[PDB]
């Protein structure tokens, strides 16, 4: 895993010694080279995972997340170079360094075999994200959003540290392979109940769970575009990955202890979806859609069946790609019209036809159109939850309506109808925005051809 950490940490001299006019070109070129290099993690075996040393390993669950992260960094570099065009050079280099540090922390978080190292860099991912949100956010409410995000995460995740140190003192090790071969059942006691709660609540907050999701429609809105990409495409999936890793040790208490939380998502993904029917804000609409999809992921993890696990992996990857693309489209509209409200700019298909095509395709992939991997993940979670209980299909099917009921709604008021008369600064679409949309979307449709590389470690 040293072959990816070292070039990522050498990206900082690359971005700090470059000229004032070629930082973007050099950083995008070398991050695309690292994304190409990332494909050597597909050497997965049907029985054994890929173990590199005592410190790092990568099974078939971490590999799609690593490839997605190192593919996502150049996309952020291309997106965040227009609202920072007038910025000072030193602050531009500091922003690029924050992005590089965030990628380095993420790609060594996804590969740590030891759990306290995973916790340490899982919380080291807080600092660059928070700095980006509270520094390069636009309006006044970025400070409150940063406070909410940081304090929800830390107040949920300090008992996780306490529980992990207790595990290290009790079992004797925190290596994931040793814990895979030394796992003991957890009996029925109040101590084990709070053990389960301390292990679960950090990832509950970072998923987010309904009722603990109040930091999402702030931090996903006040942040800049690259902050929106990392907020919607990696960190939520990082919480899901941690949940998948740590649910191994919490058997068989989970078989009843997951009983409330499933309801807190099974109803929750209804309510937040209904919020998208009556949202006056485009970015808030995308954030609440992310809440609903990740609640579906929560249910899939908590019922702990194989089909649900592969559905959760495919759903996480597909939702990350789709949410990043939707945030890019909303940011392009916000750059053109200088307001975030959805009803201000209407009828943009008459002026911007190809961006309307990208909008249509992104909305179609949002509402789980087959044979996309969004539909594959949603379908597999549906099969597993039907095996769990029958009436759950109702809670699925109604959601299958409401999702489309906002997605096409998001397609209409932003693209269809009569255009706004007084808005006359609708410039034609740049090559950069179209290239960003294509680089977001074409990997998703190509992954629809060969989905078996994202179907989890038990495929």
């Amino acid at each position: 895993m040293l072959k990816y950490i070292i070039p990522t940490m050498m990206l900082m001299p690359l971005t700090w010694l470059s000229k004032n006019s070629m930082i973007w070109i050099n950083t995008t070129l070398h991050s695309l080279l690292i994304s190409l290099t990332s494909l050597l993690l597909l050497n997965q075996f049907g029985d054994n995972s890929l173990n590199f040393s005592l410190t790092f390993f990568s099974d078939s669950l971490s590999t799609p997340l690593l490839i997605l992260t190192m593919w996502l960094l150049p996309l952020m570099l291309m997106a965040s170079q227009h609202h920072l065009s007038k910025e000072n050079l030193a602050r531009k280099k500091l922003f690029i360094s924050m992005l590089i540090l965030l990628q380095l922390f993420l790609i060594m978080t996804f590969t740590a075999t030891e759990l306290i190292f995973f916790y340490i860099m899982f919380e080291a991912t807080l600092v660059p994200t928070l700095i980006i949100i509270t520094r390069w956010g636009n309006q006044t409410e970025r400070l409150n959003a940063g406070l909410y995000f940081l304090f929800y995460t830390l107040a949920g995740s300090l008992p996780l540290l306490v529980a992990l140190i207790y595990i290290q003192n009790t079992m004797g090790s925190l290596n994931f392979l040793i814990l895979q071969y030394w796992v003991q059942p957890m009996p029925n006691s109040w101590s084990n109940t709070f053990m389960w709660l301390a292990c679960m609540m950090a990832f509950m907050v970072k998923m987010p769970l309904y009722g603990l999701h109040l930091w999402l429609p702030k931090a996903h809105v006040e942040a800049p575009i690259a902050g929106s990409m990392v907020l919607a495409a990696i960190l939520l999936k990082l919480g899901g990955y941690g949940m998948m890793r740590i649910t191994l040790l919490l058997n068989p208490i989970t078989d009843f202890m997951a009983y409330p939380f499933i309801m807190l998502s099974l109803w929750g993904m209804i309510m937040t979806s209904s919020i998208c029917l009556r949202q006056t804000d485009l970015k808030s609409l995308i954030a609440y859609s992310s809440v609903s999809h990740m609640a579906l992921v929560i249910v899939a993890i908590l019922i702990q069946t194989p089909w649900s696990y592969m559905g959760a992996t495919a759903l996480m990857i597909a939702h990350g790609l789709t949410s990043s693309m939707l945030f890019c489209l909303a940011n392009s509209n916000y750059e053109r019209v200088h307001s975030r409200t959805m009803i201000l700019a209407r009828g943009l298909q008459t002026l911007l036809p190809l961006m309307a095509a990208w909008w249509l395709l992104a909305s179609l992939t949002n509402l789980a159109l087959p044979p996309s991997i969004n539909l594959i993940g949603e379908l597999f979670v549906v099969m597993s939850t039907f095996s769990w209980s029958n009436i759950t299909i109702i809670l699925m099917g109604l959601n299958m309506v409401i999702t489309a009921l906002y997605s096409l709604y998001m397609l209409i008021t932003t693209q269809r109808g009569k255009h706004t008369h007084h808005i006359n600064n609708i410039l034609p679409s740049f090559t950069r925005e179209n290239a960003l949309m294509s680089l977001h979307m074409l990997p998703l449709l190509l992954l629809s051809l060969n989905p078996k590389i994202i179907l989890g470690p038990l495929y």
């Binding site: 005592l54 410190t55 740590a112 030891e114 306290i116 190292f117 290290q168 925190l174």
Partner: protein, 57 residues
Amino acid sequence: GWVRPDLGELSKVTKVKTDRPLPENPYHSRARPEPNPEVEGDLKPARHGSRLFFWTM
């Protein structure tokens, strides 16, 4: 025929030949506690380093 001692003669330390034996335990002390075993052997390096969380050394 008694001679008065001079200065410092009476304050001398003298020896006494006596028949009574030396008390082997005048303080009536009991048995002292056994000390802890000492440290012995060469210093081998620590096995697998510090063994503190994820640190290899």
